[PDB]
């Protein structure tokens, strides 16, 4: 039946998600809450602790920013691999595939970053380190204002209590957005997204039966993420313009170039 196929699709996406993303929300929360056996993360909450934990994980502000860039580059590659596992994606016009990633990657980065965050900090280096929110927020401008927004979003988003199975479909829906600027063949993308949306709706009804409002809220989160990324790109163009001798990774420059 149709519903059975939607569950098979949900499972396929989850399995692909597990193969593409090393640190899942399940693994991350197991570390944050402290219900694991492996070596706990090294905590970085100030300049001194940062110096000490360099092996466990330019001025500090710049150094931290460059760290985020490196992780972002790795993240873009993971998301690209995941995108290629979504049924129908690799058959789309190649330029449209590029467009979908260009406009979707940062929205997915914000989404997935929340999985590794709590109200007090973020897991880094595959969970081997933990950098406090207060430490990142205390960074001199315009870097401190660059870190906080991700936490503000995480706190709100994590209140939805989604699990990895939910996230796999949510992320797929976001990537297959037929309204991204410059797409050439819209219908094939919209058709794939329509099916992914049906899969997401069923996933939420079965996995969160006591939260009827979840689907509608997630649709709104997809809309919020666009405004969120817009501000992200802006705060970044400011840094690349006000912070001299700043090095922006080629992959990131390509994604940001000519972005709405």
């Amino acid at each position: 039946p149709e519903s059975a196929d939607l569950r098979a699709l949900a499972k396929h996406l989850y399995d692909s998600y597990i193969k593409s993303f090393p640190l899942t929300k399940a693994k991350a929360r197991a570390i944050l809450t402290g219900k694991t056996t492996d070596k706990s993360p090294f905590v970085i909450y100030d300049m001194n602790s940062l110096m000490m934990g360099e092996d466990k994980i330019k001025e500090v502000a710049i150094r931290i920013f460059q760290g985020c860039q490196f992780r972002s580059v790795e993240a873009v590659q993971e998301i690209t691999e995941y995108a290629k596992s979504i049924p129908g994606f690799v058959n789309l016009d190649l330029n449209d595939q590029v467009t979908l990633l260009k406009y979707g990657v940062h929205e997915i980065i914000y989404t997935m970053l929340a999985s590794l965050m709590n109200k007090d900090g973020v897991l880094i280096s595959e969970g081997q380190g933990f950098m406090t929110r207060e430490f990142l927020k205390s960074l001199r401008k315009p870097f401190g204002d660059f870190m906080e927004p991700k936490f503000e979003f995480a706190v709100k988003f994590n209140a939805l209590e989604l699990d990895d199975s939910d996230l796999a479909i949510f992320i797929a829906v976001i990537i297959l957005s037929g309204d991204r600027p410059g797409l050439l063949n819209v219908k094939p993308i919209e058709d794939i997204q329509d099916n992914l949306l049906q899969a997401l709706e069923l996933q939420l009804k079965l996995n969160h039966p006591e939260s009827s409002q979840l689907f509608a809220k997630l649709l709104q989160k997809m809309t919020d993420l666009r405004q969120i990324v817009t501000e992200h790109v802006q705060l970044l163009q400011v840094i690349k313009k006000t912070e001299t001798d700043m090095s922006l990774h080629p992959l990131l420059q390509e994604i940001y170039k000519d972005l709405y």
């Binding site: 590659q77 690209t80 190649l94 590029v98 990633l101 260009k102 080629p250 992959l251 390509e254 994604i255």
Partner: peptide, 11 residues
């Protein structure tokens, strides 16, 4: 050619 295209084409 772009970096995103290269990543997308890598089997």
């Amino acid at each position: 050619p772009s970096l995103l295209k290269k990543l997308l084409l890598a089997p």
